[PDB]
């Protein structure tokens, strides 16, 4: 019942919103996971690993360049916008809204959200493999050698870019190879980020889970802690529930703006 949810919403002083891939799929943004989630011959599992990057950094950079380039035409959706405007409106009333996102597309930022924790990183940040520096980067193309590369067709030829001409670190002394600042399969989530997330979840008095489920990851890491404080959890996702907290079934860009208005 939306009315019962809205009664909690009206009273909540600290809302934590966790968002997963559903909220980014609705902006037209490929995940690369599942049936037809292919880029050339590969799926995301194959490419988003340090082993892929070590063995074929040009191929991995072609893949990330394609993804960066495709973001230009993909736009935040009504769910992202509702979330951002809710944060602004409630902030003026002294009420806090924070986003904990699995998504690396920066769409929440483009929507206007300020308090965002990107637990898997961002397509538009780099990390230097040598000095460790993390830097924002929205350049199209990220480096000249990648211009016009990254085609997703199976029979595309590899660019096979010499490593020296992949994106390099611009601290004059360093010049290290840059990688995407995205958490890859087999890597740890940042401890500092998780500590900040734990503090927000512990202080929150209403938690929303959008475009994913409480029962799987990453929600499963924190949602039980919230529930066990007696705090309501509201899921917005296209997933079904049997005859059995709150669940609003459907696309989040339809459900969420009504819930959050």
């Amino acid at each position: 019942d939306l009315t019962a949810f809205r009664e909690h919403f009206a009273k909540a002083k600290h809302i934590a919103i966790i968002t997963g891939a559903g909220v980014s799929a609705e902006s037209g943004v490929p995940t690369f996971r599942g049936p037809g989630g292919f880029w050339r011959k590969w799926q995301a599992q194959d490419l988003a690993t340090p082993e892929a990057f070590s063995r074929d950094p040009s191929l991995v950079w072609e893949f990330y360049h394609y993804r960066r380039e495709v973001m230009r035409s993909k736009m935040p959706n009504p769910a992202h916008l509702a979330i951002a405007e809710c944060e602004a409106r409630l902030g003026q009333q002294g009420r806090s809204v924070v986003i904990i996102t699995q998504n690396i597309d920066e769409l929440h930022h483009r929507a206007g959200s300020k308090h965002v924790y990107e637990i898997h990183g961002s397509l538009f940040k780099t990390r230097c493999m040598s000095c460790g520096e993390v830097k924002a980067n929205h350049k199209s193309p990220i480096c000249p050698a990648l211009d016009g590369k990254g085609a997703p067709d199976p029979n595309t030829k590899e660019a096979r870019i010499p490593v020296e001409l992949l994106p390099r670190c611009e601290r004059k002394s360093c010049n290290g190879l840059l990688r995407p600042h995205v958490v890859w399969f087999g890597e740890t989530l940042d401890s500092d980020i998780l500590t900040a997330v734990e503090r927000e979840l512990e202080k929150c008095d209403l938690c929303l889970v959008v475009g994913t489920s409480s029962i799987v990851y990453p929600a499963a890491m924190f949602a039980p802690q919230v529930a066990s404080r007696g705090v309501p959890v509201a899921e917005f996702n296209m997933e079904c529930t049997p005859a059995t907290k709150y669940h609003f079934e459907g696309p989040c860009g339809s459900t969420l703006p009504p819930a959050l208005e």
């Binding site: 898997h120 958490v183 890859w184 399969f185 087999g186 890597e187 740890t188 989530l189 940042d190 401890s191 998780l194 990851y217 890491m221």
Partner: peptide, 8 residues
């Protein structure tokens, strides 16, 4: 430190 997706 936490393993992205619990390693699954």
């Amino acid at each position: 430190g936490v393993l992205k997706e619990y390693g699954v």
